[PDB]
Every structure is written in structure tokens, then in C-alpha cells.
Amino acid sequence: GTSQWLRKTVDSAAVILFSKTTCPYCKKVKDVLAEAKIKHATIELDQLSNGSAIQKCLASFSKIETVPQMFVRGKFIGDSQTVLKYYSNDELAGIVNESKYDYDLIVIGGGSGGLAAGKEAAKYGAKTAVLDYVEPTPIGTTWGLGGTCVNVGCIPKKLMHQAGLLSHALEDAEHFGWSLDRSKISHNWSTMVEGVQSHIGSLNWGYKVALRDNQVTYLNAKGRLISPHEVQITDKNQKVSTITGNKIILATGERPKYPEIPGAVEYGITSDDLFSLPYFPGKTLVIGASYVALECAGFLASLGGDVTVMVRSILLRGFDQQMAEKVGDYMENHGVKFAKLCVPDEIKQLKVVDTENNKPGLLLVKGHYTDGKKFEEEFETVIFAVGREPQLSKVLCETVGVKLDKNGRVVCTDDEQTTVSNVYAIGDINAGKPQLTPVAIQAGRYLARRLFAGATELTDYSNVATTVFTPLEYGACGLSEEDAIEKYGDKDIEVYHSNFKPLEWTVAHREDNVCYMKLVCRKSDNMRVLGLHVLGPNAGEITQGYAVAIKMGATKADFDRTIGIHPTCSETFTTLHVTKKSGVSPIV
């Protein structure tokens, strides 16, 4: 596979140097390029097992087998004397700049995946442009560079989650000896939002500075792929232009869905609006049962809010359903109200948002339960969390030939390639892939390395760990119990489980036998860990390390041999013994 690898690498790399760590002529070229401020990829052949074979294969491209060999956009440009010739004649800058296209890479979308791909490509001398545009929500909310996670996703969600957790810290404080009057303590929504938004602002600015420092052209513009290599751009002044690029990365993400009911778009809000909302939501209805719905409902209740969640059928569809029930039970026990087996019919406005006192309006929500009984209740705020959708009709001309699935997501190969061979898709729009920030980032970085630095490594989308940041957090890595049983049969599945209690909860008088963990294992494969699940505080911190072990093919024996750290919650994974089949209670 050496010949195939080199053919691909030479064809795709923007500026690449084939080198050896011990060669003085290679160092001379490296020093020249560094002085000339020419960024490039470097392949050290003496550090590869097939390095000798690569040298021989290079002759098919350069007619020489020696090092160094420099290539620019598919063409051999010279050995050490030749590169220094260009340098001494003021020709080098022009040569390493010659291109058929404006850019080696155009990234459409300045979110998690797009920024990661763009920055990484620039490192290897790919002339890169990143396009980002945020179409305003129906009520007019917009934000800066960084995409969903930075502005209206993971970052503000976790910060508001923390504000909520601090409510319970205030309660715990008394039991640990702290003297305070909780009856005189209140939360100010707008002060929290201002703090959150100040941090988001530093991230917006941070990414702009990063792109500048990486010599990436940032355009705050709407991009449209009109042919394989042509991107139509519309700027802030509505001026339309066309730029060209060799490789294109589609990383445009998704936006919240709205139910097709009267009043939904006019009066409801989504997560897009919530995180910069100038007024306190007040009495809130969340319509939906996604992790987004439950996370938002969760922190609103902890901030003292009157919160109701309207659930069509089940919670967290796709997630382990035992764990999902436990997540919901905790929320219900702590004041989140659930309108079960219930759907909305219409939203009517009873009061407009006060824009000078920053107070919410009032809405009438009409719906019905499956039993036929009517739902009719007043809420100050209605939040829709009924899923998210790609919007590639706004990004992609149909004549380009990029294939989309029934859901409107891009059908990709295992190296992120679309049906148009120079066009790639990463992040939430990549059909079938886990829709998470670190996945988008890994995909973008690994892709950029393959395109421009001769890397071979593909992104591994299997056993990607997750955490739902509900009031009691839920971390998971691998298969749900039901999926493992479906795949391998009940007779081949063993489940080890236990309740636990954080030491911190003892003095604080919190619940016994609520925090919970399980390992789903395959009996015939040396008790291989197929799935890990934990409900408890800091579940993300607990889960992460185990994801490495699971990647390596951890068995129950590996967990058993490892010694716990005491006192922690995570140590409970090291001493599990109660099986579900035994019928023994998991209580402690």
C-alpha cells in the first residue's frame, strides 16, 4: 500500500517536504522555509518502517530517490540546491503560492468542526478560508464566531448547569457548618446571562485571533457551493462574489426544529434564544424530551423556576432506557413537573415581553393527553426542544451532486468524503455520526492531516463517550443494555451494577440508592465491557478515563484488577459484583 499512499499524499498536499532527521541538506531547506515564513508538512522517512520503499516510489514523481524532496500542489519543485536557488533569486514565495484556485481549502461553517479543520490545514501551508454566518432566529437572536457549542450549546449550557448546581451547594453549605440566611438568597437571571455572555464574547474574539494568527482568511459571509470548486459568498452589505477552492469542507451544522402548530414560531423560543435571553424565563414549559430539553428544564428548576416538561412518549430516545427513567425520576423528585403522554396543539399570546424592565410575557398553551383530556395552562416562557435539523438547501446547490439522505444529512465515506470527491463533510451534518463537539473536532483535525500532511489515521466513531448534564448527570460509553441484548442475545449478556452515594451527600443529607452504575458485558468474549453507564455528580469526569480502557477492549477482569481511589464515586466501578440475573438488590 506504499505506492497508493504516496500517490494520494503527493496529489493532495499543498506544501510538503520529504526529509530525514539526520540529513544536513534537509535542515538547510527547513531553515530556508522557516526564514521565508513558508509553512509546510514534513515527512521524516527514517522514522517510518517503509521509508526505504517510499524513497524508491518518490522517483515516479521526481526522478530522484534522495532527500530532501519538496512538492507544491502535486508537483515536484526541487531538491536542496533547487529550493535554495528559488530562495536566492526571490522566486520561492511565488512558486509556493502558485495555485489553480484562490484557496487550497474553503471551510463553509465556523463551528467546532470547521474551525478545527481550518486551523489544522493552515499549519501545513494550505491556503485556507473559513466562512461563517449565523442566520438569526425568528425573534432575531444572533451571535459571533465559534458555532453551536461556543454560543448556544455546550458552553452556555454547562455554565447555567453550574449556576444551578451552586443552588444546591448553598443548601449543602449549612450542613457543613456554614452560617447563612437562605431565606434572603435569590438568583438573578440577567446577572448570570451577562457573565455567561462575557465568556462567550472572549471565545468569539479568541477564535478570530486564532484564525488571524494561523493566517486563515476569515469571512463573515454566507457561503453556497455552486460547483465542486466554486463557492458563492454574500457579505454583510449583501454584496455577492465567488471564490474558488481545491478542497471544500462542509461543516454548516444544524438548527432547532419547531413543531408545525399555530403560535410556535411567533411566541416560542429554542436553545438558540435561551442562552442570551434578556429577560428571566419565569414559569416555563419545555416541549420535548431530548437531552437538550431535560438539561434546560433541569437548570431552570435549580435556579428556582417553575418548570414543566411536556413529553410525547419517552425520555432520551436512543439512550439506555433504564438510565433515562432514573434521570427523569430524579428531576421529578426535585420539582420538575412532567406532562406525560401529552402533545401541544397551539400557543396563544397573553402578554408581550417587557423590553424595558426585562420581564417575560405570558402564553396560553393548549394541548391534549393521549387519554383525550385537554391540556390548558399559562406559561411565561415556552421552549421547544423537539430536535435539530440540517439546512443544506441554504448551503448546497442541487446541481453540484452531493448526495443527502432522507433526513437531509450528507452521505459520507469513512474518510468524510462526499459523492463529490474534493468535497468533504464533518460534524453534525455527517449522516450516521455521533453529534458531539469533540467528534466534529477530531474529524476536522484528522481530515486536515490526511489531506495536507499525508496522514492515514481515520476518525474512530465507535464507543464515543457522552454525558447528559441534567441535575443529576448521566455519563455513558458504549452500548445501552437493550442494544447489547438485541445484538448478542440475552444469554450472552451479563450486567454488573450497584447503587452508590457520594461521600459529599452524607453530611448534606441527600439520597441513598439514587446514584447508580452498571457495566454491560459479553459473556462469550471474556466478559468484554460493551457498555458503561453512570448516574451521579461529575459523571463526565468519571466516564472519560474509562473510554480509553473500553477503546482498548477492557474486560470485567481489567476493572477487577484495577485498584480504586478512595474516597471517590468512580472507585465503585472497580469493585462491582452484583449481577442483574442473580436478582440480588443493587442497594448499598
Ligand X SMILES: Cc1cc2nc3c(=O)[nH]c(=O)nc-3n(C[C@H](O)[C@H](O)[C@H](O)COP(=O)(O)OP(=O)(O)OC[C@H]3O[C@@H](n4cnc5c(N)ncnc54)[C@H](O)[C@@H]3O)c2cc1C
Ligand Y SMILES: N[C@@H](CCC(=O)N[C@@H](CS)C(=O)NCC(=O)O)C(=O)O
Range 522-581, binding Ca ion (CB under 5 A): 560, 562, 574
Q: Could you give the 3-state DSSP secondary structure of residue 363?
A: strand
- As measured in angstroms, the least distance from the Cβ of 112 to Ca ion is 15
Residue 289 annotated as binding site:
yes
Among 139, 540, 578, 580, contact with its own copies (rule: CB under 8 A): 540
User: Grid coordinates 432575531 are at which residue?
Assistant: 140
Q: Which is nearer to ligand X, 252 or 480 (CB)?
A: 252
Q: What is the CA radius of gyration of the chain?
A: 28
Is 324 within any annotated ligand binding site? no
25's contact among ligand Y, its own copies, Ca ion, none, with CB below 5 to 8 A by partner kind, is: ligand Y
566 is catalytic: yes
HEC string of 247-280 equals: EEEECCCEEECCCCCCCHHHHCECHHHHCCCCCC
Residues 40, 175, 566, 577: which is the catalytic one? 566
- Per the structure block, which three cell numbers stand in for 81? 540546491
In the complex with its own copies, the residue whose CB is nearer, 193 or 365, is 193
Enumerate residues 6+ apart whose C-beta is below 8 A from 190. 278, 279, 280, 358
Report which of 83, 138, 67, 147 is spatially closest to residue 115, judged by C-alpha positions. Answer: 147
Per DSSP, the three-state class of 358 is: coil
In the complex, least distance from residue 540 CB atom to its own copies, rounded to whole angstroms = 4
Nearer to its own copies, 63 or 561 (CB): 561
Question: 411 vs 549, which CB is nearer to Ca ion?
Answer: 549
533 binds its own copies (CB under 8 A): no
Ramachandran angles phi, psi of 192, nearest 5°: -60, -50
| 586 vs 499: CA distance, rounded Å | 6
Q: Which three cell numbers stand for residue 381?
A: 416562557
Q: Which does 574 bind (CB under 5 to 8 A by kind): ligand X, Ca ion, ligand Y, none?
A: Ca ion
Q: Which residues contact 161 (CB under 8 A, 6 or more apart)?
A: 295, 298, 299, 469
Instruction: Give CA–CA dist 371/373, Å, rounded.
Output: 6
Interatomic CA distance for residues 240 and 573, integer angstroms:
58
Q: Which does 538 bind (CB under 5 to 8 A by kind): its own copies, ligand X, Ca ion, none?
A: its own copies
The grid coordinates listed for 5 are 499512499
| Residue 521 contact partner, candidates ligand Y, its own copies, ligand X, none, CB within 5 to 8 A by sort of partner | none
Binding site for ligand X (CB under 6 A): 108-114, 131-134, 147-149, 153-154, 157, 222-223, 251-253, 271, 292, 394-395, 427-428, 435-438, 440, 566
* Residue numbers 26-85 binding ligand Y by CB under 6 A: 55, 66-68, 79-81
Smallest gap from residue 119 Cβ to Ca ion (A): 17
By CB under 8 A, residue 583 contacts its own copies: no
Q: Is 442 annotated as a binding residue?
A: no
Nearest distance in Å: CB 293, its own copies: 19
Question: Which amino acid makes up residue 559?
Answer: F
Indicate whether 23 belongs to the interface with ligand Y (CB under 6 A).
yes
Q: Which of 292, 382, 287 is nearest to 338 (CA)?
A: 287
Is 267 annotated to bind a ligand? Reply is no
Q: Which of 220, 244, 358, 538 binds its own copies (CB under 8 A)?
A: 538
CB of 561 to its own copies, least distance (A): 6
- Matching residue, cell 477492557: 554
Q: Which does 132 bind (CB under 5 to 8 A by kind): its own copies, Ca ion, ligand X, none?
A: ligand X
509 labelled as ligand-binding? yes
Terminal alpha carbon distance of the chain: 56
Q: How far apart are CA 293 and CA 339, in angstroms?
A: 13
Q: How is residue 563 annotated by DSSP?
A: P
Q: How is residue 254 written as a grid cell?
A: 444544524
**How many chain residues touch Ca ion (CB under 5 A)?**
3
Residues 441-480 that bind its own copies (CB under 8 A): 442, 460, 464-467, 475
Tell me which residues in 79-138 interact with ligand Y (CB under 6 A): 79-81
The sheet with strand 381-384 has its strands ordered as: 337-340, 307-311, 284-287, 381-384
Q: Total residues contacting ligand Y (rule CB under 6 A)?
A: 10
The entry of ligand Y, ligand X, Ca ion, none that residue 471 binds, CB within 5 to 8 Å by partner kind: none
Instruction: Say which entry of ligand X, ligand Y, Ca ion, none residue 252 contacts (CB below 5 to 8 A, set by partner kind).
Output: ligand X
CB 252 within 8 A of CB 105: no
Question: Are 428 and 254 a contacting pair, CB within 8 Å?
Answer: yes
> Which position among 42, 69, 167, 322 is part of the footprint of its own copies (CB under 8 A)?
167
Q: How far is the CB of 295 from ligand X (least distance, A)?
A: 7
Task: Specify which residues 249 forms β-bridges with.
Answer: 107, 424
405 binds, among its own copies, ligand X, Ca ion, none (CB under 5 to 8 A by kind): none
Closest contact distance (angstroms) between CB of 18 and ligand Y is: 10
Cell of 345: 396543539
| Phi and psi angles of residue 283, each rounded to the nearest 5 degrees, phi first | -60, 120
For residues 248 and 192, what is the distance between their CA atoms, to the nearest angstrom?
Answer: 39
Binding site for Ca ion (CB under 5 A): 560, 562, 574
Residues placed in the known binding site: 20, 55, 67, 80-81, 112-114, 132-133, 148-149, 154, 157-158, 222-223, 225, 252, 255, 288-295, 312-313, 317, 387, 391, 397, 428, 435, 437, 483, 509, 560, 562, 566, 574
Q: What amino acid positions are annotated as catalytic residues?
A: 566
Q: Which residues are annotated as a binding site for NAD(+)?
A: 288-295, 387
